[PDB]
Amino acid sequence: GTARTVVDDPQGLFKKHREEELAERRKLYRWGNWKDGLILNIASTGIHDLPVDERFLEDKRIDFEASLAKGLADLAVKDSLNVLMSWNSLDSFNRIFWSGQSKLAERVRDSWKEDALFGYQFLNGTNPMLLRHSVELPARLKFPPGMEELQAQLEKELQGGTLFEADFSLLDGIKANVILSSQQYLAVPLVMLKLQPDGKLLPMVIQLQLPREGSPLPPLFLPTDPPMVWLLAKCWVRSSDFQLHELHSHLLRGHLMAEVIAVATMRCLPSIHPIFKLLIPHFRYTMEINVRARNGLVSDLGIFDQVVSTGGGGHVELLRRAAALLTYSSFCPPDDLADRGLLGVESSFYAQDALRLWEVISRYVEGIVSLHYKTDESVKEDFELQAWCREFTEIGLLGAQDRGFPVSLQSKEQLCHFVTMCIFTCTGQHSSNHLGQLDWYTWVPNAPCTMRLPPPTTKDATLETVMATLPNFHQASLQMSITWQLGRCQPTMVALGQHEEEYFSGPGPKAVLTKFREELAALDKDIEVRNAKLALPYEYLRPSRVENSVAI
Ligand SMILES: CCCCCCCCCCC#CCOCc1ccc(CCC(=O)O)cc1
Ligand SMILES: [Fe+2]
Numbered sequence: 001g002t003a004r005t006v007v008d009d010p011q012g013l014f015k016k017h018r019e020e021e022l023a024e025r026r027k028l029y030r031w032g033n034w035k036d037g038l039i040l041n042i043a044s045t046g047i048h049d050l051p052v053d054e055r056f057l058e059d060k061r062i063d064f065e066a067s068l069a070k071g072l073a074d075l076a077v078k079d080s081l082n083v084l085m086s087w088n089s090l091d092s093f094n095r096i097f098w099s100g101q102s103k104l105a106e107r108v109r110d111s112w113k114e115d116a117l118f119g120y121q122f123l124n125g126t127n128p129m130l131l132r133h134s135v136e137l138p139a140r141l142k143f144p145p146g147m148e149e150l151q152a153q154l155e156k157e158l159q160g161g162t163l164f165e166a167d168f169s170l171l172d173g174i175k176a177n178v179i180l181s182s183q184q185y186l187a188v189p190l191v192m193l194k195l196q197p198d199g200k201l202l203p204m205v206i207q208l209q210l211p212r213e214g215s216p217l218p219p220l221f222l223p224t225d226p227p228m229v230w231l232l233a234k235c236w237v238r239s240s241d242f243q244l245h246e247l248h249s250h251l252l253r254g255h256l257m258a259e260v261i262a263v264a265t266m267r268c269l270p271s272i273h274p275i276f277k278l279l280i281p282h283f284r285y286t287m288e289i290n291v292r293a294r295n296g297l298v299s300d301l302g303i304f305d306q307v308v309s310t311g312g313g314g315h316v317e318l319l320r321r322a323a324a325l326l327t328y329s330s331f332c333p334p335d336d337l338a339d340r341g342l343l344g345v346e347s348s349f350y351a352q353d354a355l356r357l358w359e360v361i362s363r364y365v366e367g368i369v370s371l372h373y374k375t376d377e378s379v380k381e382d383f384e385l386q387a388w389c390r391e392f393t394e395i396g397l398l399g400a401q402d403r404g405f406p407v408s409l410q411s412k413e414q415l416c417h418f419v420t421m422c423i424f425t426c427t428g429q430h431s432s433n434h435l436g437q438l439d440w441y442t443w444v445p446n447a448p449c450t451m452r453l454p455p456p457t458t459k460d461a462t463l464e465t466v467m468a469t470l471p472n473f474h475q476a477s478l479q480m481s482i483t484w485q486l487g488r489c490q491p492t493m494v495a496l497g498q499h500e501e502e503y504f505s506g507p508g509p510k511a512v513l514t515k516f517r518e519e520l521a522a523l524d525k526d527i528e529v530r531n532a533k534l535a536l537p538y539e540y541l542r543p544s545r546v547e548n549s550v551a552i
C-alpha cells in the first residue's frame with residue numbers, strides 16, 4: 001500500500017492496525033545484552049529463538065553451512081600433512097596457500113614484504129578506517145639517542161603536509177589469549193608514513209609498544225634495519241591491524257551497529273511507515289548472522305578463543321571500550337574523511353568511492369523522503385520517528401546523544417542525513433571492511449591472527465624469531481578457512497539496490513528507485529574504468545560488489 005505516517009492520518013484510520021503491529025513487534029524484537037558495556041543486540045539465545053522472518057532461507061543456510069564444512073575439510077587435510085613436516089621458512093606458508101585464491105591474494109603472496117604494499121593497505125586494504133593525517137608528532141613517539149636523521153625526515157613530511165599515522169592505542173591494556181596452554185601476545189603499535197607525490201604511502205618508522213615512565217624507551221624500527229628485524233616489526237603491525245580491523249572496523253562498526261539500527265527500527269516503525277519501507281531490505285539476515293557470530297565466532301571456545309591473540313576475553317574488552325567511543329560523524333564519510341584528512345588524497349580510492357557512494361545513496365533517500373514529507377513540520381510531528389531515534393540513541397547505543405547521535409529529527413535535512421547514515425552503515429560501511437578479507441588475509445603473514453612470542457624490544461630478530469612468532473600451521477589454516485568462508489563470492493548475495501520486493505507502491509517511489517539503480521550502475525562503470533588503469537584495482541565500494549545488508 002501507499003505509505004502513511006501518523007501525521008498523514010489525523011482521523012486514525014490506520015491507528016489501531018499500526019499500534020497492534022508495534023505492540024507485537026516489541027514482543028518479538030526485544031533488546032538483549034550479550035556483554036556488559038556493548039551496544040545492545042536482539043534478544044535471542046540462538047538462531048532457533050529468532051523471529052521466523054529473520055531466519056536464513058534455505059539457499060543461504062545451505063551455503064553458509066556447506067562453506068564451513070568445506071573450510072574445515074581443507075583445514076583437516078592441511079593439518080594432516082603439516083604435522084609430518086618442518087615449519088622453519090616463510091616458504092612453509094606456501095604449503096597452506098592452496099589453489100583457488102583471488103588474483104589479488106596471489107599478488108599479496110608475491111609482494112607482501114614490499115614496504116609500499118604494507119603502506120598501501122592503510123588507504124585501500126581491508127581496514128581503511130584507522131589511518132589519520134598527522135598535524136603534529138604523537139606524544140607517544142619518543143626518540144632514543146642517535147635518531148636525528150629520522151627526526152628531520154618526520155619534520156620535513158610534517159611541514160609538507162605529507163605525514164600520516166596509524167596508532168593502535170586501543171590495544172593498550174588488552175589481555176592476550178592462551179591457546180592449548182601456550183601464551184599468545186599483543187603489541188600496541190604506531191606507524192608513521194609518508195605520502196609521496198606519485199601516491200605511494202611508505203612506512204618511515206614503527207614503534208611496537210607505548211613508552212613507560214620507569215623504563216627505557218621502546219625501540220624505533222626503521223626500513224634500514226636488518227631485513228628480519230624490519231620484517232618482524234611490519235608483521236606485528238599487520239597482526240595488530242587484524243585485531244582492530246576485525247573487532248572495531250568490521251564487527252562493531254559494520255555488524256553490531258547495523259543490528260542496533262535494525263532492532264530499533266523493528267521496534268518503532270510500523271510496516272505502513274515510509275521510512276520502515278525504505279530501510280527494511282537493508283536489514284536482511286543481519287540478526288541471524290550476528291547471532292551465529294556470538295554463538296561460534298566470538299563466543300566462549302569459539303574461533304577467536306581458538307586461534308586469535310585477543311581471543312579469550314580481551315576481544316570483548318576491546319569491543320566495550322570501542323563501543324563507548326563511537327561517534328555519529330565517524331559513520332558519515334563526508335565527516336570521517338574530513339576529520340582524518342583523507343579528503344583530497346588522490347591515492348585513497350576508498351575515500352573517492354565512499355564519498356561517491358554516500359552521495360548516490362543520499363539522493364535516493366532524499367527522493368523517498370520528499371515523496372512522503374513535504375515540510376520540516378511533518379517530520380517534527382511524526383512521533384514514531386521521534387520514538388525511533390530515541391530508542392536507537394538512548395537505549396540501543398547506551399545513551400549516545402553526547403557523541404552526536406540524534407534523539408529527535410526536526411527537519412527533512414536531518415531525517416535524510418540520518419537515514420543515509422543508516423543505509424550506508426548496512427551497506428558500504430560493511431562492504432568496505434568485509435570484502436578485503438578474501439584478498440589480503442588468506443596469505444597469513446600479511447595479517448597474522450595471532451603471535452606466539454612477545455614483540456621484540458631489540459634489533460636482533462632472525463628468521464627463526466619470525467617463524468616462532470607467526471601463527472602455527474593450525475592457527476594459520478583456520479584463519480584461511482574462515483576468511484575464505486566469509487570473504488568468498490557470495491552465492492546468495494543481493495547487490496545494493498537490487499532487492500526484488502516492492503515495499504513501495506506507485507510510480508513515484510518506483511522512479512526514485514530506478515534512478516538510484518541508474519546512478520549506481522554509472523558509478524560502478526566509472527570505478528571499473530578507473531580500476532583498469534591501476535596496478536591494483538580497488539573493488540570494495542563498487543555498487544556491483546556492495547551487498548544490500550550485512551549478511552555475512
Ligand atoms: C581466524 C579468524 C579469521 C576470521 C575472522 C573474521 C571476523 C569477522 C568479524 C565480523 C563478523 C561477523 C559475522 O560472523 C560470521 C560468523 C559466524 C559464525 C562463525 C563460526 C562458524 C562458521 O564459521 O560457520 C564464523 C563467522
Ligand atoms: Fe561481515
Ligand SMILES: [K+]
Pocket residue numbers: 005007008372373374378
Ligand atoms: K508526511
